[PDB]
Amino acid sequence: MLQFYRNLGKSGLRVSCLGLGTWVTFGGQITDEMAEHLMTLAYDNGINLFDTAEVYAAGKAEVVLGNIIKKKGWRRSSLVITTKIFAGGKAETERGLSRKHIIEGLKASLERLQLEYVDVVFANRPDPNTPMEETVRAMTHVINQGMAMYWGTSRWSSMEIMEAYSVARQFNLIPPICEQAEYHMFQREKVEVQLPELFHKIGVGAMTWSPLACGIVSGKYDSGIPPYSRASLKGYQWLKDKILSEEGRRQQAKLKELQAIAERLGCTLPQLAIAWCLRNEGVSSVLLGASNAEQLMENIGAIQVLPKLSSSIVHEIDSILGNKPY
Amino acid sequence: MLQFYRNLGKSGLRVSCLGLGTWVTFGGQITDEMAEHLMTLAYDNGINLFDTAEVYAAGKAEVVLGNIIKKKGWRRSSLVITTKIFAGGKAETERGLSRKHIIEGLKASLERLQLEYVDVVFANRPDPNTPMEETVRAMTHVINQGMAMYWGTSRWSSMEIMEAYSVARQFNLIPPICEQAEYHMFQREKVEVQLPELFHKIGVGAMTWSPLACGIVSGKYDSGIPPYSRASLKGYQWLKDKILSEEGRRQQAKLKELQAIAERLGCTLPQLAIAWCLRNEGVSSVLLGASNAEQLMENIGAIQVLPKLSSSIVHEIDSILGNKPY
Amino acid sequence: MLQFYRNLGKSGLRVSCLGLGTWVTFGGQITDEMAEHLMTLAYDNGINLFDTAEVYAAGKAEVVLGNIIKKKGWRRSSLVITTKIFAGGKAETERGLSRKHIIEGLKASLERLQLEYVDVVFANRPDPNTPMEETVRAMTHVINQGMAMYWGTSRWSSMEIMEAYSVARQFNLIPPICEQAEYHMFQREKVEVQLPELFHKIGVGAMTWSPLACGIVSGKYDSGIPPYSRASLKGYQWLKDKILSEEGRRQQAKLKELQAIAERLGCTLPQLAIAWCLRNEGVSSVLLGASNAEQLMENIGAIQVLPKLSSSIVHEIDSILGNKPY
Amino acid sequence: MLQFYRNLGKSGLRVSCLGLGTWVTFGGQITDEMAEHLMTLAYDNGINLFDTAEVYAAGKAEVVLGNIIKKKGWRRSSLVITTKIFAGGKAETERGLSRKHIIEGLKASLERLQLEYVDVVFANRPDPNTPMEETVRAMTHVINQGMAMYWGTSRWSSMEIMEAYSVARQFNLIPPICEQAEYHMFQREKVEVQLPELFHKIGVGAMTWSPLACGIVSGKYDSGIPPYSRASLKGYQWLKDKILSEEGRRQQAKLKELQAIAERLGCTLPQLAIAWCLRNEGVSSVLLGASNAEQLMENIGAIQVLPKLSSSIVHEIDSILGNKPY
Ligand SMILES: NC(=O)C1=CN([C@@H]2O[C@H](COP(=O)(O)OP(=O)(O)OC[C@H]3O[C@@H](n4cnc5c(N)ncnc54)[C@H](OP(=O)(O)O)[C@@H]3O)[C@@H](O)[C@H]2O)C=CC1
Ligand SMILES: NC(=O)C1=CN([C@@H]2O[C@H](COP(=O)(O)OP(=O)(O)OC[C@H]3O[C@@H](n4cnc5c(N)ncnc54)[C@H](OP(=O)(O)O)[C@@H]3O)[C@@H](O)[C@H]2O)C=CC1
Ligand SMILES: NC(=O)C1=CN([C@@H]2O[C@H](COP(=O)(O)OP(=O)(O)OC[C@H]3O[C@@H](n4cnc5c(N)ncnc54)[C@H](OP(=O)(O)O)[C@@H]3O)[C@@H](O)[C@H]2O)C=CC1
Ligand SMILES: NC(=O)C1=CN([C@@H]2O[C@H](COP(=O)(O)OP(=O)(O)OC[C@H]3O[C@@H](n4cnc5c(N)ncnc54)[C@H](OP(=O)(O)O)[C@@H]3O)[C@@H](O)[C@H]2O)C=CC1
Ligand SMILES: C[C@]12C=CC(=O)C=C1CC[C@@H]1[C@@H]2C(=O)C[C@@]2(C)[C@H]1CC[C@]2(O)/C(O)=C/O
Ligand SMILES: C[C@]12C=CC(=O)C=C1CC[C@@H]1[C@@H]2C(=O)C[C@@]2(C)[C@H]1CC[C@]2(O)/C(O)=C/O
């Protein structure tokens, strides 16, 4: 009963239940050649959603993404391209959600992307130094300028998202259509409890990220930090610490148990985790990440796992994780 | 007492009581040469309204229409060009009334038409997957961008049209000026009963289509499906089935009777049917269709029939049709 | 105590108490060479206001005006250029105050004028076929598009002007700043009684036209229709009839009497009439007309007459005219 | 506890506590070479705020400023460029806060600056001939046109600033973010008493100017008008009169006393005065002025003085000045 394509929240924007992101990989960990192959595989498999950000690889991720789109020549109208704005430089005025950086940042992202507009522009995170009204007016402005079709939030609290809606309705501006939130077996609270309320109240959709907790859910770290793994990359010592932390090892213990259900269902752990992220209608789309073609094809195969996630299967997983939100 | 030119609803847009459409014919059933001749004949006879759609002939109808306008060099200010948006591609995001497709779709139609803007952009049909607010904001945006002068609805229910007005007045956006509805002797309810209410309440005008029920009213199918007829064209098996259906034959029976009044008045059946469509002020303009010059000139001659449609004549027709709405 | 420059109504637009119009003369009755000289004389004498219209000489007036501006190279910021829109073609959709013609009409005027925008765009007259809301939205749109700085009305009733303000305040649009009304010794009611109310209520300014009643006030028709006079021009038989009419001769009788006061003051009749038009603060600016340099220099000399228009002088004129409004 | 960078009022625009202005110097008193050096020194020292005006050196200040920015090639996103509009020509319509001059004036400033937009456009002073609504709509328009990111006021009373906010909230326009006010030891009332109220009430920020009272606070006029001093420049006889005035000499007397505290703290008088201007959070940024590199480097050194401005030090200064506002 799964519908591969669904509306992003209550907006009219239709997206595939699975998207492909560019964090770490594009313009960084992987070659442009591998990136091209990954996007082609995604696109050919129905995926129309591709996420990026001005900060990814200091802007190179957007460059690679734009190059592929141009080289492949896919119709712009058949793609949903999203980017996020917060950190776009070292200068004081090159970061934040001020009108100045919103406009300068998106303009610079579009130039790198070789695109006239993105379908959704996201505030990559909350800005405690900029009043909501200024931010909402700036997002509304770029949409009115044809630089984006819609806008959204990322890593914002339920209250801050409602605040953006409040400002939009008071000054007759455009409200946000989606919140890009982290969601995986070890981070469920926000997406399972809070976001559903925002959907029914103000139509906000949930586009989730890091469905494998940066690859931790794959269980490839059951025995240390494998070579070439994200956790072994430069600038990702923070990930390695989380993996080697006390809590990071307790997660591995639970994973081994989840692995049992995986093989018992005839799928891999990553496929179980990803399918798990889509088990509820509440999630509009799960943004995937992959360093090679084997991972992506495996991940996409998660769709076939959905039908096997019965009530019993879900309860067993909850008993194992032991973190089912109230 | 007929006024050849009238306002489209309560808007200031003045249109001829007869327009020329491009469905099936332009870029499809007829040659560009024949299309040029038909439009010239229309224009030279006072017709200033020409309708098309992104979906007609996969966009070719708009191409032919734009070519003629350019080749003939008529002043853009002397023309009322309308197009409709819903289905503009095979991709998921290439259909619907989302802001994304509204903007991408109209932009693509304008490029094909070689025009900077259309006078009216229509939503070709209702979109159950896009909230009215998003659609109304998108229509308002393209009007503000100078891509269209006004917007309208097509195949929308009275309630959905009122809903668009509601959103427009609540968020101070631009309301629709017209609804493009089917109207002929075998489809009267909506146009005769509901649309008049929308005109007096929210100024919505009625621009009607298929005045001959795709040619069925001409009675050329009194004996099967004549060669080259629309019903015998590829992709129009649906029309042939309606003609050969039980109800389709009962219509022919009534037509034969209507034919009596036609010849009794000194006009053809198509002229009687078309003049009938304009008998009431409620209809701002009737969109004509034609595959050759004989049909168009005949159709235009319907204007001369109007004066003969007395109360008695109208009552006789009602008795024959037996479908006068309450 | 006269201030040569004053605000046009309550707006911030500052105009000279005297402007130079282009009706009949520019691109028509006079040569481009004479037009250039007249504008230069005006500009050099402090006049910054120049009025035209899409209908004047079928658009040639705007062409000549734009040529002079370009040839002389005066700073655009030192000029106040106004044009009026209603009749811009023979086609049905080429006339009126519909959004379509407002945009097409002004765009075409600007191209002829070789200007990016006019300071004020006027609706040349009321349009009974277009709802006020559509007209006000269209004027607001062109101002927002940078095609005009402000907009105004011409030949509108006090109630229709208040209606435009009503729509502007209800839908948060831009209200009109001025009404271009006829004003001379034989047409005082509207300007003296009604316009002052609009100024204090909604800040509307009064820019008056035909201060010499098309030249009739000069008294050059005291003995028929002199050669080369406007009344003897082709297409102005209507003016000749008004002059030769019973009322037209009764005006001449009164003029002869006014002539007495003129010579008694040391000025010409035209100078007395023009100075009379500016005697009250209510009039922001009087638009002058002239076929040669002698008339213009004479007319401009009306400024020196103002100081002599005492209460007694004004009362004597009222006794003669006998048309002082209540 | 000083934060070099702070928000300009409640807006999201982040500026350095010290800015560099161009009045008198750029394109005038100093060479383009010296101007380039001064800006480079400022920029390299963290200063991101540079102020100018259409009136400075008849537009040359903006030309020099734009040349430096272009020659140095600093990222536009790392700069906060502000300009002020009021007097942009000799013609009547070339001055004021009318929509006409706002648009023409800023457009001309941007061309001279070789920039697409300024971060903040200021009304250089109040305009008693233009209604607030017109001015606020014009500022909102240029911001919506991408010609400026924000707008502000300069030399406006607290009530006039609140009036601009009132109009903005009534017609849903954009309110001002900052007021550029004079602030130095001999002008404290407005900035110390009134502006703080506007900050808490409507978020208006305080960007101050002439922190050395045009150089008077430096005490270089303790013995007349030194050569090359601003007071000895052409067109600045007004400054010399203020210095040589009775009150101007009484200020010198107080300065000599302040000098005691300066040397007693280990800093110069200008450093004490400038640091004094930043002692309170109320001031977002102090705009500096300098004719040579020695002055600028000295002035910037005022930051190190801030830590020494204890309560006692501030009280001693108040006792000396004897002008502490109520
Ligand atoms: N809004 C925001 O702030 C954020 C948004 N995002 C978005 O979400 C997207 C996805 O996030 P991401 O963290 O990459 O997602 P995941 O948590 O799914 O991690 C994907 C990474 O895990 C590894 N992996 C993937 N599949 C497999 C597999 N089958 N077997 C083994 N290892 C596998 C790969 O890394 P390796 O091979 O190197 O181990 C890959 O790069 C991003 O690209 C971005 O677009 C992400 C973070 C934040
Ligand atoms: N908003 C919407 O969804 C829709 C809008 N429209 C608009 O309305 C327009 C008119 O619709 P359309 O269905 O073409 O109109 P009609 O119902 O009037 O049918 C016209 C067709 O009937 C035949 N015909 C026309 N005149 C004669 C005649 N005198 N004698 C015999 N046959 C005749 C021709 O087909 P043939 O010779 O092949 O038999 C011609 O193509 C369209 O072109 C389009 O612009 C149409 C449908 C939907
Ligand atoms: N909003 C609207 O609908 C209208 C606006 N206007 C505006 O107002 C302007 C002025 O109107 P207009 O009717 O021309 O003004 P006047 O009533 O002042 O008439 C001017 C004409 O009278 C004659 N004249 C002028 N000065 C003298 C003189 N000193 N001695 C003798 N004859 C003289 C000239 O015509 P001749 O030498 O041929 O006798 C000249 O063309 C127009 O150009 C236009 O811009 C005008 C009409 C309508
Ligand atoms: N909004 C508005 O209406 C106004 C805004 N402003 C803005 O504020 C900025 C600063 O104003 P400004 O009056 O120049 O500032 P100051 O009051 O600080 O005076 C600076 C001037 O004083 C002298 N000076 C500076 N430092 C020293 C020093 N250490 N020792 C001795 N003399 C020194 C220099 O002049 P010299 O060497 O010639 O003596 C220099 O040009 C302007 O450039 C402008 O951007 C200014 C006025 C009005
Ligand atoms: C998609 C939309 C309009 C286009 C856009 O850029 C952002 C949004 C977000 C909020 C949506 C809004 C609508 O279109 C109407 C909605 C969906 C509203 C939330 C409640 C709402 O007002 C409602 O429930 C319809 O009545
Ligand atoms: C034409 C118009 C404005 C231009 C446009 O793009 C769309 C519309 C549709 C609705 C119209 C509106 C008007 O202009 C004023 C009308 C005609 C309104 C319906 C009721 C109305 O408000 C009225 O009755 C006047 O008072």
Ligand SMILES: C[C@]12C=CC(=O)C=C1CC[C@@H]1[C@@H]2C(=O)C[C@@]2(C)[C@H]1CC[C@]2(O)/C(O)=C/O
């Ligand atoms: C000039 C202006 C704004 C710019 C414009 O394009 C048209 C107008 C016309 C109406 C003016 C308006 C104002 O600026 C404020 C005014 C002048 C208003 C009439 C009453 C008003 O609201 C008032 O009295 C101030 O309080």
Ligand SMILES: C[C@]12C=CC(=O)C=C1CC[C@@H]1[C@@H]2C(=O)C[C@@]2(C)[C@H]1CC[C@]2(O)/C(O)=C/O
């Ligand atoms: C920065 C801002 C919006 C961007 C802009 O161009 C100008 C302003 C000035 C007024 C600010 C406004 C806000 O962003 C919200 C503020 C800061 C408001 C003053 C009160 C306010 O409404 C408030 O207190 C938040 O609730």
